[PDB]
């Protein structure tokens, strides 16, 4: 289930980095799959079996435990693709590249950063990245917030919780 500019992030929203797009959850929600977000479970119990306890991690019965989904490894308390187990990126994260039959772990970088081909394609080179998100909601546009691109309020507008739409002048 690839993530593109037309993906619907249920209970989440799209973000864009130097070389990929993904869904980021709202509030305290965690990823169940690549484009759905649900409430997490703090303490895995017998009632919590098969319920999400983190990003790409469900509670399973040994008995209670929070294990990563198939194809994910728990590296630094975060479930990441197994191909990324040994890939450190610096100013970015490791993503699963499927452009070739043999998959690889490659770095995707914060806005302003690009894979430095002289540094194992780690995020140690300054480079441009044009936003491609479709910010179609009212008074919204693509902005660089905390290293990632996202649809946010245009300058002079804030989200009011009485309507959840960017408001101002």
């Amino acid at each position: 289930a690839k993530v593109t500019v037309d993906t619907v992030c249920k209970r989440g929203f799209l973000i864009q980095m130097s070389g990929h797009l993904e869904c980021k959850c709202e509030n305290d929600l965690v990823l169940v799959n690549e484009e759905t977000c649900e409430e997490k479970v703090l303490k895995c119990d017998e009632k919590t079996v098969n319920k999400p306890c983190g990003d790409f991690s469900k509670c399973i019965k040994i008995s209670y435990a929070c294990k990563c989904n198939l194809g994910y490894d728990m590296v630094n308390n975060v479930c990441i693709p197994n191909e990324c187990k040994q890939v450190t990126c610096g100013n970015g994260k490791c993503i699963l590249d499927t452009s070739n039959p043999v998959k690889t772990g490659v770095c995707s970088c914060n806005i302003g950063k690009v894979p430095n081909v002289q540094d194992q394609n780690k995020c140690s080179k300054d480079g441009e990245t044009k936003c491609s998100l479709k910010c179609l909601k009212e008074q919204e546009t693509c902005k660089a917030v905390d290293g990632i691109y996202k649809c946010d309020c245009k300058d002079g507008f804030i989200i009011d919780q009485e309507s959840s739409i960017c408001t101002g002048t």
């Epitope: 197994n82 890939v87 590249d97 039959p101 002289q118 194992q120």
Partner: antibody, heavy 120, light 108 residues
């Protein structure tokens, strides 16, 4: 189709040098390392080093740099491995291989290997 | 240098399960790649990032990696699986490492 085609077998005297080529095709040359792996007859695989086709940079395995020079020609997408001051013990099959420029990517494509035979 | 230790030889009966091990200090933290090499041929990737199976490799091949031992498991071994098998990890001190290799002999 990704292909790594090496040059043919070589028979050399001690003290000579040989230059083995690795012709790459079917993929973006500058996106993948070119590794060289040594296999003496009856022995195991021995990583010798890589060359970065982009910057031309090299990363030699411990002490192989004393007699091995890795070069590349982006113009014709060929990497080269030059063995200097050959000794009979250098007899081996030499392979080239590629992996995506990143951390710990697998060697998904290998050349057919070149047998270098060194004998007085 | 980082040391990968493989058994020099493994023997199994046809149709039985074979297990090739690759020892290393906390090898669970490294992505292990496995290469099969038959006589006269270049090595061939048969398992990568511990358990990803390349397209074209039989489902009898499975990979695992936990603690201090990465394992290549070949269930229902056929005679064509008789070859040398090499594991491979990257060490963050900037060098690749091949294991010693395991000769797989199919009895019968």
């Amino acid at each position: 189709q990704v292909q790594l085609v090496q040059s043919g077998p070589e028979v050399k005297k001690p003290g000579a040098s040989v230059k083995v080529s690795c012709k790459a095709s079917g993929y973006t040359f500058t996106d993948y390392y070119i590794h060289w792996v040594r296999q003496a007859p009856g022995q195991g695989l021995e990583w010798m080093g890589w060359i970065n086709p982009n910057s031309g940079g090299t990363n030699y395995a411990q002490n192989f740099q004393d007699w091995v020079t890795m070069t590349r020609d982006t113009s014709i997408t060929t990497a080269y491995m030059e063995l200097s001051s050959l000794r009979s013990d250098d007899t081996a099959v030499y392979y080239c291989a590629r992996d995506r420029i990143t951390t710990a990517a697998p060697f998904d494509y290998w050349g057919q290997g070149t047998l270098v035979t060194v004998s007085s | 240098s980082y040391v990968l230790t493989q058994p020099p030889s493994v023997s199994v009966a046809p149709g039985k399960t074979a297990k090739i091990t690759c020892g290393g200090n906390n090898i669970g933290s490294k992505s292990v790649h496995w290469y099969q090499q038959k006589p006269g041929q270049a090595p061939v990737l048969v398992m990568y990032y511990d358990f990803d199976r390349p397209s074209g490799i039989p489902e009898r091949f499975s990979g695992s990696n936990s603690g201090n031992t990465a394992t290549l498991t070949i269930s229902r071994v056929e005679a064509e699986d008789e070859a040398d098998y090499y594991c491979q990890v990257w060490d963050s001190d900037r060098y690749w490492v091949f294991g010693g290799g395991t000769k797989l002999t199919v009895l019968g």
